[PDB]
């Protein structure tokens, strides 16, 4: 298998300098890892900050939960690798049935 040289859209990123991670009802923090043997050289993991969701006042409501949103990415190590990424959290209501 031969890998052509060049990365489409190499010039394109997502901004985390918006405080979207902190203005969310299911807010989360971030973590970075730099690993030189791979591309992207850095992988960003999110971790939900609370078990409940926060309201307009700032209080934790544990009737609802912050839960992680996850996507499988491909990262190169040359060999392909599949890594799980937590991009952020959402607020959900439990199932009552």
């Amino acid at each position: 298998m031969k890998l052509d040289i060049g990365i489409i859209n190499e010039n394109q990123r997502v901004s985390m300098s918006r405080n979207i991670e902190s203005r969310s009802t299911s807010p989360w923090n971030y973590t970075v890892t730099w690993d030189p043997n791979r591309y992207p050289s850095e992988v960003v993991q999110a971790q939900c900050r609370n078990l409940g969701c926060i309201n307009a006042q700032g209080k934790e409501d544990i009737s609802m939960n912050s839960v992680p949103i996850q996507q499988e990415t491909l990262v190169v190590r040359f060999q392909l690798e599949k890594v799980l990424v937590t991009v952020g959290c959402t607020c959900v209501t439990p199932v009552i049935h």
Partner: antibody
Amino acid sequence: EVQLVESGGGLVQPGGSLRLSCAASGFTFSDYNMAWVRQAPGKGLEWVATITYEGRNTYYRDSVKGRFTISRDNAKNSLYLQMNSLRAEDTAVYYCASPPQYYEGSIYRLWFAHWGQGTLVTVSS
Amino acid sequence: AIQLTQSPSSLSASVGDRVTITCRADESVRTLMHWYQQKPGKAPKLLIYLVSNSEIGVPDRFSGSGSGTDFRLTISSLQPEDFATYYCQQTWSDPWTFGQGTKVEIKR
């Protein structure tokens, strides 16, 4: 990815002592609370002890208070349970347990996302 | 200490049937109810967290439900490899407690 690897089980006589070890790998051991859960032969699960990330607080179940001691070395990525004055009710498989990597470790009330393979501790003369 | 009581203690169903396990608590644990699956001679594996959320690798047929004192684990199409003992757990009150176990067997 996450690996919890226990060792140090085996045979011990009543009153004797035993130190269990849990070698962690695949996550930032230094950020999360760790625990021990045990299970006596053919019975259910029973929380034993919890330790916090820095090491400052240790919580135990009533049965093991004064006898067991939970410990951690964040530099060797390792969790410990020193068991003393061992009694026949402590015959059990002892599991190391880790919380999930996708929630902040400051949260106390987290669940057990990851378990070690377990060691049998048999307390017998 | 919150005492958890699972119903039934054992049950048998044919491959493909809907199986339902119940877990009841003394006091309200709110949404801090979790479920585990333990196969013989293996460690427990997490199935459900925060009442109704599933871990990444958990099959689509496992689902959680519940409110404050009444929670339920459901297997929508029982398969042979689902033979296990299922445990509920709460992390609301400081002495963390498990249910007693429900053993799920397969009728064939």
